[PDB]
């Protein structure tokens, strides 16, 4: 009916350190997207461009998160390693930087 | 319809010694009031709680607040705290809770 | 403070069935918790639920939650339903009831 | 501290139709205002002006609305009587005509 249609956006924006991974020539910078879809596909995200990613607003999208984020991506060493921008997108509460916050709570490992 | 008006939640708690009072079996008045929940478009939660169906404003929840109240004039008596919150959201963790203690990943 | 980011309520319903593989006294797991989300910026209700403190934003409830599914994995086998909801105002009725009771007026 | 401090403003919009009661000389206008001002005071309701009262944004903001509307005013026969117009006045949700609600809800006596 005419209600419960319209959550707050929640998503986030990835960047990664595209010159890094060529530099250093461990990864293979094609795969990498595509074991980030695969996390998104397995979280329930909506792909929105090559750094962006959405929830499809109801009410799992808190859980979709959780399972995108906390537990696929940073744990993922070859991600969090050669990230230059990681954004929690949050519409109504604002967004904030996911690798500050990160590094501060020991959560995933950066160098 | 309208984004101003939210869903509501009601939550409370009687006290049991003067609910004994006026009921022998103090399982009876939780029924009452369940009942009348649901009939004013209310439901009960599988922890605690009547949350409103559909999004209700604040007038028409206090109206059934007084309603409930005339009905049953023992509330007065026996009431320990009784709230109306505004929902903002409501988000299922469930199945995600669920998925985070399947050790599959690592 | 920052206005958009409001105060989370947590309701959960487990499984007695479940809970008794995992302890003896079905009471010990839900002190268990309630001493965990007390430690986490959570106070318990007279009703029931866990209502933050001051407001937290979504991101680091998720991560309490985290946590939590993490010091007690036997979360998962007994859950039957595990919510957060955005808290947009909450209301205080109690000495109302009373006074509606108070037939001093008509 | 910094926080609990900006509740959404509750109220109400009295006009008492004046007209109505002089040409009729049941009531003395005066008093009828000091009645609807003691109301006001028993209930928690903060007066802004001759027509207007407001709760003080705190969490019994509901109680107080429920007395002053919905047990003092309502059940003043003198007051429905003679009142012009009504309103609830809520920010969040939108206002709302009291005198037209009340006589399909069968509140009060009118007539």
């Known amino acids: 009916d005419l209600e419960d249609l319209a959550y707050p956006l929640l998503g986030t924006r990835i960047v990664l350190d595209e010159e890094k991974i060529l530099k250093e020539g461990k990864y293979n910078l094609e795969d990498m997207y595509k074991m980030i879809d695969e996390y998104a596909k397995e979280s329930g995200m909506i792909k929105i461009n090559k750094e962006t990613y959405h929830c499809k607003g109801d009410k799992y999208d808190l859980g979709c998160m959780t399972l995108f984020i906390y537990k696929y991506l940073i744990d993922s060493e070859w991600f969090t390693k050669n990230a230059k921008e990681w954004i929690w997108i949050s519409e109504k509460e604002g967004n904030s930087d996911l690798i500050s916050a990160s590094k501060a709570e020991g959560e995933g490992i950066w160098e | ?106």
Chains 1, 4 share one sequence.
């Open chain 2, 1 to 106: 319809q309208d984004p101003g008006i939210n869903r509501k939640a009601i939550n409370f708690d009687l006290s049991t010694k003067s609910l004994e009072k006026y009921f022998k079996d103090t399982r009876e008045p939780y029924s009452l009031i369940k009942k009348f929940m649901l009939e004013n478009g209310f439901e009960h939660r599988q922890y605690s709680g009547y949350t409103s169906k559909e999004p209700i404003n604040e007038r028409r929840v206090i109206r059934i607040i007084n309603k409930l109240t005339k009905k049953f004039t023992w509330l007065g008596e026996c009431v320990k705290e009784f709230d109306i919150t505004e929902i903002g959201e409501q988000y299922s963790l469930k199945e995600t809770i669920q998925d985070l203690c399947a050790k599959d990943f690592h």
